[PDB]
């Protein structure tokens, strides 16, 4: 949407825009206010047979669409809690999501000037390494770390450990 990629008028806290719990207030600001909530619902109702179509569609269709800072947090919210729903049901989801996240990590790094939410993103990386993915994707992560900015490369030595 141009409200995502082009209209970047909102510079402050974006996580309030990625939750329908904030829409308890008169806080419908976008179509994306609703589409996440059904994404909260439908994928909760979806079994692993329905959920298995999601990662291929993300890694093939929705992969080069993320261009602004908002789409990055939008696709991180798109997988975040449901990773637990992915966790018990499919190890292919762990392999594909480690490969996919570390693929678009360099993709957004190639096409960024300044991003300010690297601290919660690195905390999420720590969380998924320690809780979600373990160390399934390790070797290619080193090469992708070698492709990062040195300031971005600094805070993932423990990821390399």
């Amino acid at each position: 949407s141009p409200s995502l990629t082009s209209e970047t008028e909102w510079v402050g806290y974006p996580f309030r825009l990625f939750d329908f719990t904030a829409c308890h207030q008169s806080y419908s600001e976008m179509s994306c206010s609703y589409t996440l909530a059904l994404a909260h619902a439908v994928w909760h109702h979806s079994s692993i047979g329905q959920l298995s179509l999601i990662p291929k569609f993300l890694t093939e269709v929705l992969l080069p669409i993320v261009k602004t800072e908002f789409q990055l947090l939008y696709v991180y919210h798109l997988v975040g809690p449901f990773l637990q729903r992915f966790q018990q049901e499919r190890t292919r989801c762990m392999i594909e999501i480690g490969v996919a996240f570390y693929d678009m990590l360099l993709n957004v790094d190639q096409c960024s000037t300044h991003l300010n939410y690297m601290d919660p993103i690195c905390d999420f990386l720590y969380h998924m390494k320690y809780m979600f993915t373990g160390d399934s994707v390790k070797e290619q992560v080193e090469k992708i770390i070698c492709n990062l900015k040195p300031a971005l490369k600094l805070r993932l030595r423990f990821i390399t450990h």
Partner: protein, 346 residues
């Protein structure tokens, strides 16, 4: 028997510190902290006669500052009356005097001692302005000449700490017609070094100048309640109570003015749509339509207010579903009517 006689007979042979102190102690039954008796007046008198200053007087002044013999204000009073500005070597020596005992100024005494310290630093900065004006005109008449580059190095370290700024500002208020000569030389200070243009000296020099004129994220639904309470029942008052409420709210919590106008308009829309049907719908729509230009005209009068509301509307024109729900009740486009109302208000 004189102090001048005493420093003279100390000068005639070579004495080190310990025997000199022993002689000074046996001479006077009363110490009198060696300052109210004015010891330091003749200490700088005989050290400036020669073009090359003697090291004996410098070694004499070394230990007295390090010990409790000579205080810090007495050196400043003597150097502040140095005037002349004739030779470069004694100016460099005066700069080297400033290198150790200054920047602390720990006054352990009475309140009058601190008042004297404040006026001493006032006259000292006046002498700093005078000596830098002399060192700048020396370079101006010369054309490396790093003498002014070290005078500004002296200048920047005399104002780095916050206590220097506090002392200068608290001495500014207590004294009248004293800071006038400060800007009388400051008007020349900027322009002389602007004539001698440098790639980097101007930045730090005018940073110290701006300091010496300096001596004299998160959504906030708090104001949502402020706007919403007024139109509930106490909407029959004047236009100034709500103004002195909401403008003061911006004082308490850091609020961007585009965010302020964003809240101003979204509250007007919410009070329109979320009002239930009946006489309360009409009352709320009238409240959101007829008192919001009155406060904004006064805000424009008291305040830049044209540019920020454009970004406020840039924020505002994204709320599609909530404000589209208002158009079901209103059966029409309220945006046209309100953006002609703003033009009617000018």
């Amino acid at each position: 028997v004189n102090l001048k006689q005493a420093i003279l007979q100390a000068w005639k042979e070579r004495w080190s510190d310990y025997q000199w102190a022993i002689n000074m102690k046996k001479f006077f039954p009363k110490g009198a902290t060696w300052d109210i008796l004015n010891l330091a007046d003749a200490l700088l008198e005989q050290a400036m006669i020669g073009p090359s200053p003697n090291p004996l007087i410098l070694s004499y002044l070394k230990y007295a500052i390090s010990s409790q013999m000579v205080s810090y204000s007495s050196v400043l009073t003597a150097i502040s009356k140095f005037d002349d500005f004739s030779r470069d070597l004694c100016v460099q020596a005066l700069l080297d005097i400033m290198d150790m005992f200054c920047d602390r100024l720990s006054c352990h005494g009475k309140a009058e001692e601190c008042i004297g310290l404040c006026r001493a630093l006032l006259s000292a900065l006046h002498w700093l302005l005078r000596c830098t004006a002399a060192s700048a005109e020396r370079l101006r008449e010369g054309l490396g000449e790093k003498q002014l580059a070290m005078c500004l190095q002296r200048l920047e370290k005399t104002l780095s700490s916050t206590k220097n700024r506090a002392l200068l500002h608290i001495a500014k208020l207590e004294e009248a017609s004293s800071w006038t000569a400060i800007e009388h030389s400051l008007l020349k200070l900027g322009e002389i070094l602007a004539n001698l243009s440098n790639p980097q000296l101007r930045s730090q020099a005018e940073q110290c100048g701006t300091l010496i004129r300096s001596i004299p994220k998160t959504g906030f639904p708090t104001v949502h309640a402020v706007i919403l309470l007024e139109g509930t029942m106490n909407l029959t008052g004047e236009t100034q109570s709500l103004v002195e409420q909401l403008t003061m709210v911006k004082r308490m919590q850091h609020i961007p003015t585009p965010l302020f106008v964003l809240e101003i308009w979204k509250a007007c829309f919410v009070g329109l749509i979320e009002s239930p049907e009946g006489t309360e719908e009409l009352k709320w729509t009238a409240f959101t339509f007829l008192k919001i230009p009155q406060v904004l005209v006064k805000l424009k009068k008291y305040s830049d207010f044209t540019e920020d509301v454009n970004c406020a509307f840039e924020f505002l024109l994204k709320l599609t579903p909530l404000l589209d729900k208002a158009d079901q009740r209103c059966n029409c486009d309220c945006t046209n009517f309100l953006l002609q109302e703003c033009g009617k208000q000018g």
